[PDB]
């Protein structure tokens, strides 16, 4: 596992205009800002 | 027919067109007038009128009736998306004359007389004074000549 590592986990911030099926000349200014974790992970209940 | 639909809707009724042209000279006798009057419309200011196509597109996005108007035009929907016009050069003696005035005044004249050349003028107008409201096919009317 030394020929392939991972340094740190980051996130993403993607923007997008609503799809062509909902495209009106006044709704292109309602961008759907979103986030997505990079190299993160999800767990069960916190041990603590 | 000279180079190489017959239904018309009116008041929600379809009446088929059964025209015929058993020869060829009336055809080009008409087409020559068609093209002739088609030519004298374009003028200097047509260049300015052409770079206004994208404004018409953004308005077609902005308003509603523009959307009915834009899509029957089998040409504008293509050019403003596939044709461009660079910065127009300055008009010779641009401080005295005015192009758009001409390119729009020489179109009012050539347009009214258009249909009355490929067809006929209107000589009579139905003016019912005290009779019925409309007139069915085959009833006697009342008129005054144009």
């Amino acid at each position: 596992l030394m020929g392939d590592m991972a340094e740190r986990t980051t996130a993403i911030l993607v923007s997008s205009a609503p799809d062509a099926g909902a495209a009106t000349a006044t709704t292109r200014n309602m961008r759907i800002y979103d986030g997505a974790l990079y190299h993160g992970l999800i767990m069960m209940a916190y041990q603590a | 027919r000279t180079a190489a639909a017959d239904v018309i809707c009116y008041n929600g009724r379809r009446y088929e067109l059964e025209t015929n042209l058993q020869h060829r000279d009336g055809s080009d006798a008409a087409i020559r007038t068609l093209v002739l009057n088609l030519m004298f419309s374009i003028n200097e200011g047509c260049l300015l009128l052409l770079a206004l196509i994208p404004t018409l597109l953004v308005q077609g996005a902005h308003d509603g009736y523009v959307n009915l108007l834009i899509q029957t035009a089998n040409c504008v929907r293509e050019t403003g998306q596939l044709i461009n016009i660079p910065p127009m050069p300055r008009i010779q003696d641009g401080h005295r004359r005015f192009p758009i005035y001409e390119t729009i005044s020489s179109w009012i004249s050539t347009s009214s007389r258009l249909g009355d050349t490929l067809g006929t003028r209107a000589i009579l107008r139905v003016c019912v004074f005290d009779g019925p409201s409309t007139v069915h096919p085959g009833d006697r009317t009342a008129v005054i000549q144009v």
Side-chain angles (χ1 to χ4, degrees):
Chain A
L1 294 174
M2 306 315 120
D4 260 349
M5 298 186 293
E7 307 173 341
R8 87 284 193 193
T9 180
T10 180
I12 308 175
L13 202 61
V14 287
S15 167
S16 90
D19 203 300
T24 66
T26 174
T27 201
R28 282 197 91 82
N29 294 322
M30 289 182 229
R31 319 194 63 88
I32 306 163
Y33 290 120
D34 212 38
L37 263 185
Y38 203 61
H39 281 144
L41 202 42
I42 177 153
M43 331 198 303
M44 304 304 108
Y46 182 30
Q47 296 81 325
Chain B
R1 185 181 295 273
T2 297
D6 37 357
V7 157
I8 175 59
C9 320
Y10 172 76
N11 192 84
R13 285 295 173 82
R14 283 196 190 85
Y15 308 141
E16 300 158 19
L17 266 190
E18 299 78 8
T19 188
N20 76 323
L21 304 90
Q22 68 194 356
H23 55 67
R24 63 183 67 87
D25 219 345
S27 64
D28 66 356
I31 299 178
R32 56 177 293 253
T33 81
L34 167 57
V35 173
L36 273 177
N37 298 64
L38 207 66
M39 288 140 69
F40 286 70
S41 89
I42 322 182
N43 283 268
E44 201 46 68
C46 167
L47 282 80
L48 168 56
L49 283 153
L50 275 156
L52 291 158
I53 292 166
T55 46
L56 300 199
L57 268 287
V58 78
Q59 288 168 308
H62 185 125
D63 303 307
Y65 172 62
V66 298
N67 189 325
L68 159 68
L69 269 179
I70 180 65
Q71 292 302 145
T72 77
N74 283 347
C75 79
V76 175
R77 57 191 282 282
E78 312 273 321
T79 74
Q81 318 213 45
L82 274 302
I83 310 292
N84 186 306
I85 299 295
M88 41 173 189
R90 47 205 283 150
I91 181 55
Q92 308 291 109
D93 194 348
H95 84 81
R96 182 221 64 205
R97 67 169 296 242
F98 301 99
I100 309 299
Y101 177 99
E102 302 156 289
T103 196
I104 212 165
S105 42
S106 65
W107 182 81
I108 303 313
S109 199
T110 313
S111 309
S112 89
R113 56 195 269 170
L114 166 69
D116 316 330
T117 289
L118 284 201
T120 55
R121 69 184 189 279
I123 50 177
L124 304 148
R125 65 197 191 104
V126 165
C127 168
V128 286
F129 282 77
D130 303 69
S133 277
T134 53
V135 166
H136 292 211
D139 309 336
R140 308 206 201 194
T141 43
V143 79
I144 172 63
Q145 67 203 38
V146 169

